[PDB]
Design a binder for this molecule. Structure first.
Ligand SMILES: N[C@@H](CCC(=O)N[C@@H](CS(=O)(=O)O)C(=O)NCC(=O)O)C(=O)O
Ligand SMILES: N[C@@H](CCC(=O)N[C@@H](CS(=O)(=O)O)C(=O)NCC(=O)O)C(=O)O
Lengths: 216, 216
C-alpha cells in the first residue's frame, strides 16, 4: 500500500519532505492532524508501532519511522540521493545542518511573547548565514551541483519562511532569489504548489506568535 | 597528516564525536578555543577554507567539514558504520534525532535566567523520552544491537548531561543506567575518560546558567 506520512496540517518540519516526495513523484497518503485534533493524535501516538512516537512519522510496507530528518533521508536514500561516497554524503549532511540552523533559528523565537525583539537579533545574524549559501550557489545550479538533493528542498522551505519574516532579506542575495524561483520552476513542484494538497499556512504550530494562526 | 578537530574547550556538540574517534582509535589533533579565545576564532573563522564556517569543524587530507552531525557521520561512514541498507541507515538516523531531542532539550534552556522554572518543565517531559530508549535497550546491548554505532556515544553524552541536571533521572530506567556503564566499560572509552585529553567540564558554553562556568 501507499506510504503514510503523518503530521499536523502545517508546513513545519515536514514540508521539505512533502516537496521531495512530489519531486520524486512518489505516491503517498497523509494523516493530517487539524489544530483541534491534538487528542486524536494522543490516543494514536503509542498505537502506531513507532519505536520513538512523535510527529512527523512515516509508515510504509517496509519501515516505521519518526524524526523528520531520518524520514527525508530515508526517502532520498531509497532513490540513491544521499551521496556516492563518504565525502559527498558528508557534504550533503553539512548542507542539511546549515539549512537547519536557519529554519530552527526561526522556530526557536517564533513562539515567544517578545518575537519582535528576538527577530531583530535574528535578522541581524541571518545575512552571514545566507551569504554562505549565496557563495555555494555562485557556480552551481543546486546546492550539490547540477542535480537536486533533499537539502535543496530544505533550503527552499527555509527561504520561503524567512521571506514571510522579512520580504527583503534576500535583496542582497540574487543567487538565492534565483534558486528559490528555480525550485518553483521544477514541473513537479509547480504542479504541487498549485494543487489542493499544498498547505501554504501556517509555517509553525498554530499557537506560534510568528507564522502561526489559521491565516497568513 | 592527522585530521584536525576544532571546537571550544567544552563538551558541547563535539563530545560524542571525540568519543567515536577514541573508540575507533583514530589519530587526530584538536584546535581547542579557550573561554577567552573568541577573537582567536573570529580571525581564523573565514580563513580555514570552510564552506560553512562554524564550530565544530573537521579538517583532514580529504575533506573540510563543519556541522557537528555531518562530522560524526563522516567519521562513522569512513568506517562503514552508518548502516548496510536504507532501512538500517534510517533506524540510525532516527536514533540520532531522538537523542538530539534530549541533548538539545537541555541546551535550549541552559542559557536562560529562569533555568530552574524551565528545568521543571523539562524534567517533566524527559521520562517519556528516556523510556523510549529504555524499551529500545530491553533486548539489545547497544542501540542498534550487538555492535556500537555513533548514536550510542550521542546517547551516552546526553545521559552524562541529564545526570548532572538530575542525578536521579535514571532511577526508573535500569537499562539506561547499565547502558551508560557499558559504554564506560569499553576499553578505549575508559582509557580516554582517564587520560589528560578528556574535557569533563563545562557541558555547555562557559556563559550558560546550567552546565557552564570553569568548574563543576
Ligand atoms: N526531532 C523531532 C521533533 C518532532 C517534534 O517536535 N514534533 C512536535 C510537533 S512540531 O514541532 O513538529 O510541530 C510534536 O508535537 N510531536 C508529537 C508529540 O510530541 O507528541 C523531529 O525532527 O521529528
Ligand atoms: N548546527 C551547528 C551549530 C554550531 C554552533 O552553534 N556553534 C557555536 C558554538 S556551540 O554552540 O557549539 O558551543 C559557535 O560558536 N560557532 C561558531 C560561530 O558561530 O562563529 C552544528 O551542529 O555544528
Amino acid at each position: 500500500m501507499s506510504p503514510i506520512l503523518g503530521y499536523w496540517k502545517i508546513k513545519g518540519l515536514v514540508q521539505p519532505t512533502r516537496l521531495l516526495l512530489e519531486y520524486l513523484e512518489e505516491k503517498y497518503e497523509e494523516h493530517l492532524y487539524e489544530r483541534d485534533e491534538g487528542d486524536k493524535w494522543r490516543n494514536k501516538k503509542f498505537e502506531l508501532g513507532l519505536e520513538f512516537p512523535n510527529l512527523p512519522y512515516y509508515i510504509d510496507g517496509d519501515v516505521k519511522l519518526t524524526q523528520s530528518m531520518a524520514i527525508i533521508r530515508y526517502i532520498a536514500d531509497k532513490h540513491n540521493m544521499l551521496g556516492g561516497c563518504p565525502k559527498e554524503r558528508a557534504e550533503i549532511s553539512m548542507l542539511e545542518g546549515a539549512v537547519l540552523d536557519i529554519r530552527y533559528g526561526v522556530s526557536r523565537i517564533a513562539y515567544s511573547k517578545d518575537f519582535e525583539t528576538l527577530k531583530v537579533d535574528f535578522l541581524s545574524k541571518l545575512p552571514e548565514m545566507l551569504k554562505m549559501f549565496e557563495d555555494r550557489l555562485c557556480h552551481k545550479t543546486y546546492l550539490n551541483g547540477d542535480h537536486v538533493t533533499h537539502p535543496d528542498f530544505m533550503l527552499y522551505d527555509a527561504l520561503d519562511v524567512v521571506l514571510y519574516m522579512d520580504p527583503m532579506c534576500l535583496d542582497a542575495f540574487p543567487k538565492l532569489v534565483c534558486f528559490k524561483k528555480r525550485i518553483e520552476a521544477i514541473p513537479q513542484i509547480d504542479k504541487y504548489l498549485k494543487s489542493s494538497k499544498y498547505i501554504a499556512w501556517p509555517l509553525q504550530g498554530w499557537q506560534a506568535t510568528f507564522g502561526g494562526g489559521d491565516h497568513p
